């Protein structure tokens with residue numbers, strides 16, 4: 257179906273203006289004029305063509321080859337001419353289960369019909385003639401190396417379409433620009449033509465004629481654009497300028513802490529004394545100069561989970577000589593553009609700066625599913641992985657000594673550092689036209705080259721989570737990399753992240769590019785500054801189509817509404833933004849508030865404080881504890897309810913005088929208190945909070 261001979265159809269007589277490149281499943285190599293909608297009528301006249309591939313016979317015999325235009329054809333089988341501008345009955349012996357190279361050239365001056373009607377036949381020893389069937393034809397070996405049975409180069413006899421990197425796309429098309437259009441059953445690759453293709457919304461591709469994969473990834477420029485590729489590769493990475501590669505971090509969903517048994521305590525029948533908390537995990541990115549790493553940071557919930565206000569040690573019965581253990585539920589997350597099949601990366605679980613508590617490994621070659629881009633392992637419809645699994649005798653306890661435990665209690669943070677060891681790659685095989693995991697292909701042989709030859713953009717426009725993409729970009733000092741097309745900042749955002757420009761303004765899902773800020777590493781910053789100066793431009797947002805990306809740039813693009821920590825996690829927002837986000841109140845009562853709040857805003861709030869203010873200006877704080885601020889919840893209808901009763905002994909607010917005010921304040925993550933004060937105070941005293949609702953009793957109804 258994606259198999260057969262590869263054909264190049266030229267408008268000129270001498271094989272130099274390719275109009276269509278496409279495959280044929282059978283010996284019918286025709287292109288009817290009805291299929292040439294994307295070619296100018298005048299270029300629909302084909303004066304030459306070349307086909308290449310292999311023939312595999314099902315039975316040894318003597319065959320004679322013929323075409324529908326023998327006077328215009330020369331054909332080679334494994335370097336030997338079988339047709340030479342004349343019909344013949346010259347038989348050739350072909351052996352079953354052997355592969356023979358095929359090259360066919362056709363030339364005809366001034367055709368009177370558009371397209372091409374052309375069939376390749378053979379006749380066996382019994383004198384039966386037919387168009388060669390699909391089971392007998394295979395594509396050329398369009399790879400960087402030959403296989404044992406299939407040479408990557410066609411015979412030096414006759415014409416060679418210039419294809420320096422052997423990906424299948426002619427040099428000239430890669431440089432000048434090409435488009436791909438899907439006929440009913442075939443993909444046609446043709447030159448870009450402004451006045452035809454622009455209006456139709458077709459993508460203009462350019463790629464390096466000297467790089468088999470312009471992004472230095474494991475899929476060729478041709479494989480990508482013709483769909484001869486792992487179906488799990490992300491849509492954006494089907495562009496030859498966007499790198500296809502996995503990017504993995506670990507998400508921790510919840511944690512349970514408990515005291516380790518010890519030989520001195522023979523008693524094992526005591527009551528449960530564990531601490532269980534939800535956790536929130538974010539993939540991070542830091543200013544570390546040379547970084548190319550995977551890491552995530554875990555925030556352990558500090559909100560009320562059990563009676564009293566005990567220390568963790570008191571809760572768990574931990575004395576100073578005891579040790580504690582952690583278990584957790586996790587998933588792997590692939591935010592990259594290619595899947596993983598047989599090796600999950602190894603992860604260190606780290607306390608503080610550099611105290612490793614655990615090394616998390618999965619068994620190689622025993623994955624229960626693929627880890628696909630924009631997805632999880634295990635999938636979300638399945639249970640997560642427990643670090644110490646119930647079925648597993650050999651899971652290492654994740655232990656902390658007393659001092660480490662106290663440090664975890666104080667910081668309520670862990671870090672997960674994940675390596676970039678991703679295993680084998682599923683590649684396309686031209687012999688059988690299928691994608692399979694290839695034992696000879698490994699991500700570790702690809703990643704360094706991807707990292708060296710691309711510009712990196714990290715963007716948080718999807719739910720404020722950091723998503724990295726890499727785009728092929730020129731390196732002015734590496735000659736091979738100068739053969740790549742110019743990559744602009746505007747184009748990179750379109751092809752890598754799906755920005756569009758419906759009305760003269762670049763947008764991501766309705767939000768203008770000006771709603772996002774640009775952050776650069778030191779070298780990228782100097783580069784971009786220099787470019788702006790050379791453009792006489794004072795504002796980057798008006799010249800995104802003129803800013804050129806270079807290999808090894810690092811660009812970070814973040815939603816401007818938010819405040820960010822050093823990990824580039826969103827942790828707050830300006831008071832004006834938070835106030836406006838809460839302005840639309842659906843209902844209010846002594847039981848709480850019902851509001852429509854934007855999902856991104858909700859992400860940066862740790863909770864709310866409710867207070868009644870009397871006429872003299874004194875305030876009664878209702879939920880007056882740092883661990884009692886979790887009073888918001890998202891309803892199924894998408895609305896947020898702020899629950900006044902939850903920490904008011906299950907009672908609606910009592911407003912003794914209608915002139916009293918009910919005030920509700922939002923507390924952002926960056927302002928959240930996560931421990932009692934040094935003096936032991938557990939109240940909300942001093943917490944930096946943002947007034948988001950204030951109404952008198954008679955206004956609440």
Ligand SMILES: [Ca+2]
Nearest residue numbers: 419423424425
């Ligand atoms: Ca090529």
Ligand SMILES: [Ca+2]
Nearest residue numbers: 464465467477
């Ligand atoms: Ca190429």
